[model samples]
Target: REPPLLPARWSSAYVSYWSPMLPDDQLTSGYCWFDYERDICRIDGLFNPWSERDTGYRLWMSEVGNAASGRTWKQKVAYGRERTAEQLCERPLDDETGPFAELFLPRDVLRRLGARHIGRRVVLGREADGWRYQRPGKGPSTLYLDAASGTPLRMVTGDEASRASLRDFPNVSEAEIPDAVFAAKR
Candidate 1:
């Protein structure tokens, strides 16, 4: 298959870091755009469980809704697979202080996906050296997918070992924090 027409922003943001784990298809199949004017991270692409409905697009780590409402969007959070809506959106990014933002597609939409959102936040990168984390505050992320339409969402499979180590801290015993990753964060 051909690569997706990914936007250039993400490529520029992470061009230096390369990870061998990223699938060729993902690299080719998506794009991330930063709306400086709106202060939002927008992504457009397609993910697995491939569907043929609507093309995917979304905005993450954005201030959605009116200022009075104060609705914040954070990507890279726990997508509760076993629990209800409460669990679906519960990720480390949530402040629990007092904010409300919708997670995942609407119920009607998820039903169409035929699968629940994995509790782990999606991850993407060059699949060689460093991986870009796409949820929560790591530049915040939002996946705009329409399950009802069955369009493929721009998504990446996460490193289960990596996510487990993050959540089950000390359980995994080892975490790779390479010099390049520190450089990227810096």
Candidate 2:
């Protein structure tokens, strides 16, 4: 069969992240931006989900939002260094924490995760409209994906996992993206 069609230039959306293992304050609300050709994205938000604010910026090699914390027009400031798709899809240069900034396309994200399963002892299945991926052992557990949309609705693992929801599904305009967006926050 033919491959699925993905956004060529840009896409924007909101997602929430919360861990069943943490306090209510640890829940995260993320606003994400995607530039398929550029190999970059950003999710700016707070560590506390109940706070209802965006307090920090997360830059992902692969992968969140709030507007009141100066993140609403972030797409205007959205930028990143140009990297090969291979580099961008690889794990973060440093340890990954909290959530991603929604930099890669959903299809690409799935491809990256799927690639990891190739050489491991992994269990794969389907539940409802999403998929179930598990590694059978005392380790980080599983992934739940939307079969129709290829979105990760929820995940559970050894020490960390998050449940997320995205809405306002629309495309972000790149009319005024500045070079400064590529520069990382100090």
Candidate 3:
């Protein structure tokens, strides 16, 4: 079993907003994952990413905001519009994959990427998928480091410059079906 191939020159990027759109009552307090490879991310605060069967294959987004005050936030997830046990906000982390791009981000593994960027590579391989979903500490929870200073970003969302530099796709209106174009082949 191998990870799916990179879409030729395809790349993924995203941002987190945690205190402007969603109120504390709507706070999706869950682990966030950041992977440069699958370009996938997750924040299953309410719903389970896998158990949810999947949503927003077209767009992915997440955030942490205050519905009452409406100020700052740390959101991240694929593009979507409803509330689920998995997604908690109403914004896309990386919204440019159109409505057909699929981002595979599982919460259980997102906690690790906080250390460093997972680097740019394909991830549908044996170690990155399938039976290895839960075995060791080798999951997908990384941070995109600063290029110049090599420092991890404290706030990866809401910033314009940061999102552009990483080549993060924009969120789409509707989620596209997970077609062969973006499905993992492990």
Candidate 4:
């Protein structure tokens, strides 16, 4: 059966994520905040292994006019950089890398891929519906979305079928994200 239609839009989102691809072969947990209307996104948490000197980091990406920019903060030190929209914002749907890869994929892409309902499951202590599909060359995968809000909760993929799970998703709105949070240097 066809899966429920994923919501086309959301004002903002703050969710916890577990990614196995971030550092490769290991799980990295982080918090992500994004305001679609504002075209800004930020991620914070442990980006590197515990063995690394600086394991805590933050990645901020925002779009302005036709260009996009990014900043990285490691252990309180900030590094500003210029980046293209394709690299920071739009590439997640095409390339399964970065923090946005599984969480921010467009509904059209999933629909086109023939995502099928695979029943319900408890994800991160919340009820979620599952959808299974085969990515062109990435192999088969299952995406679990929040049953009520259609927010992605988990993704199980890759050759070993590593899983990425979202532990929490508080209700979010435009006002919840302040302008100060988007500052590239902050």
- Each candidate's lDDT (Cα)? 0.26, 0.36, 0.30, 0.50
TM-score for each predicted model, relative to the true structure: 0.20, 0.36, 0.21, 0.51
Candidate 3 wrong stretches, greater than 4 Å: 1-25, 47-153, 156-186
Q: In candidate 4, how many Å is residue 124 off?
A: 1.9
Model 1 has an lDDT value of 0.26
User: lDDT by residue for model 3 over 1-186, one digit each (tens)?
Assistant: 222322212212333333233232122223433333334433324432222334443332343222223232333444344656556445445322222233343222233332333343222111222111222453322323233322232222223333211112222112232333232221
Candidate 4, clashing residue pairs? Answer: none
Q: Which is the leading candidate under lDDT?
A: 4
Root mean square deviation (Cα) for candidate 3: 17.4
Q: Which ten residues in a row have the lowest lDDT in candidate 3?
A: 124-133
Candidate 4: misplaced stretches above 4 Å?
1-27, 48-104, 107-109, 159-176
Give per-residue CA lDDT, model 2, range 11-62, as digits (tens). Answer: 4444444445345434344455554555555555432233323412223222
TM-score of 1: 0.20
lDDT by residue (64-166, candidate 1, tens digit) is 2212233443232233333454233433344222353432222222233333343323223111111223443333222222223222233323433332111
Ranking by lDDT: 4, 2, 3, 1
